[PDB]
């Protein structure tokens, strides 16, 4: 069972957005798919759902008139279209299968007039200055992007232990910056390879940076 959601986006105020939720691993037509918004302060808010068998829908009253939920059984895909976007629509939008077992990973939507900007990625190279005992730290600095989020993996997902991807900071310029770091044995910096994979879906930017030791 899997729900795969479309990527994060910045949208201007007044625009429309159509989010998608691709279901797999189960009988699509016999489960209600709900859309649930999670916004800072407002919390979790149900927006409505649809039963893809006959396509019957149901909408939270707060969202009536701006929201349209549809489903396409041929592609086992549910859709949510939100129009007349406003700043307070900034949130992560989840699809979830019916209570709600199985949620998608959410689609972050930022409502803003500012333009999308993909990150610059720089190595945080291990040196004697980033050793503690027999442990070395290394990482990637992911600077100057908009909107959130950037996601970071290491070695295409094969390296996860000891990874810390920090919450982004907001720079005075209004762009975001974060670091992703990991601790490894200092003894094997010469034989192991460490690559940070950075994805900024709002700009479709993908960067891989090999982090080499400095002497």
């Amino acid at each position: 069972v899997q729900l795969v959601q479309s990527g994060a986006e910045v949208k201007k105020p007044g625009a429309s957005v159509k989010l998608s939720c691709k279901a797999s691993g189960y009988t699509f037509t016999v489960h209600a798919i709900s859309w649930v918004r999670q916004a800072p302060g407002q919390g979790l808010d149900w927006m409505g759902g649809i039963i893809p068998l006959v396509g019957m829908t149901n909408y939270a009253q707060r969202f009536q008139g701006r929201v349209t939920i549809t489903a396409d059984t041929s592609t086992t895909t549910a859709y949510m279209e939100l129009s007349s976007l406003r700043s307070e629509d900034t949130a992560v939008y989840y699809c979830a299968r019916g209570y709600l077992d199985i949620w998608g990973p959410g689609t972050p939507i930022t409502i803003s007039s500012a333009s999308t900007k993909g990150p610059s990625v720089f190595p945080l190279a291990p040196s004697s200055k980033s050793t503690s005992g027999g442990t070395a730290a290394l990482g990637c600095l992911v600077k100057d992007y908009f909107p959130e989020p950037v996601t970071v993996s290491w070695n295409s997902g094969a390296l996860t232990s000891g990874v810390h991807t920090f919450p982004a900071v907001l720079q005075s310029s209004g762009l975001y910056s974060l670091s992703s770091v990991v601790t490894v044995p200092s003894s094997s910096l010469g034989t192991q390879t460490y690559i940070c994979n950075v994805n900024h879906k709002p700009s479709n930017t993908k960067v891989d940076k090999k982090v080499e030791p400095k002497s």
């Binding site: 709900s34 919390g43 979790l44 808010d45 149900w46 149901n58 939270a60 009253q61 989840y94 979830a96 209570y99 709600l100 077992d101 199985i102 949620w103 998608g104 990973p105 959410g106 610059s120 720089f122 190595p123 945080l124 190279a125 040196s127 200055k129 980033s130 050793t131 503690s132 005992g133 442990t135 730290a137 990482g139 600095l141 600077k143 810390h164 920090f166 919450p167 982004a168 900071v169 720079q171 910056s177 974060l178 670091s179 770091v181 601790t183 400095k214």
Partner: protein
């Protein structure tokens, strides 16, 4: 219908028994479900129908209550239970969620390991120098990080970020990044971050010389 959770947050030790409550403004019978959410992740269903355990959820989670008053209990708090817990009712429509209870872990003091990173050559060519100081796997969360450039105490050119509590060892990590123009960076020789923390009997300094 209004869902009211309490407390808003709590701190407990590993092995402690945790009690979270959800109050519905009107009767919902047993149409009351509980979710766990960790920072940056989707909610995960724990308990539905007010007491039925979702397959794969450990038995230390149990729910009770009926009508308007519901309890989620964790009988022996484990480090991976650090999260925010949400109740949700489904008695008719609209479905609504409580405001969440954040469960945090108290543990023994752990001193940070401290690391510093000079700017990359690639970034310098771009005209900016970011210097990163990393505090790794410490507890409690409070930490003091001071930048010194040529022994002079800095203010105004650094930003900090702290992780959520780790799900394996209940520690935190923190980054402090000093950002200067290439020109300002090249005006100085020594760059140092000094760390003060409960688990350090003396401040730890990591430093390097621009060359």
């Amino acid at each position: 219908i209004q869902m009211t959770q309490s407390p808003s947050s709590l701190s407990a030790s590993v092995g402690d028994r945790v009690t979270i409550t959800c109050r519905a403004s009107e009767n919902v019978n047993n149409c009351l479900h509980w979710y766990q959410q960790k920072p940056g992740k989707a909610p995960k269903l724990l308990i539905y129908a007010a007491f039925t355990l979702q397959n794969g959820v450990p038995s230390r989670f149990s729910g009770s209550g009926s009508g308007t008053d519901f309890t989620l209990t964790i009988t022996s708090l484990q480090p991976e239970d650090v999260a925010t817990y949400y109740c949700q009712h489904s008695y008719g429509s609209p479905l609504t969620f409580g405001g969440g209870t954040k469960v945090e872990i108290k543990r023994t003091v752990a001193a940070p390991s401290v690391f510093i990173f000079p700017p990359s050559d690639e970034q310098l060519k771009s005209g900016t120098a970011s210097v990163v100081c990393l505090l790794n796997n410490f507890y409690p969360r409070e930490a003091k990080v001071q930048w010194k450039v040529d022994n002079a105490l800095q203010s105004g050119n650094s930003q900090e970020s702290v992780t959520e509590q780790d799900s394996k060892d209940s520690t935190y990590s923190l980054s402090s990044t000093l950002t200067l123009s290439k020109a300002d960076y090249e005006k100085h020789k020594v760059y140092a971050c000094e760390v003060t923390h409960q688990g350090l009997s003396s401040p730890v300094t990591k430093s390097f010389n621009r060359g």
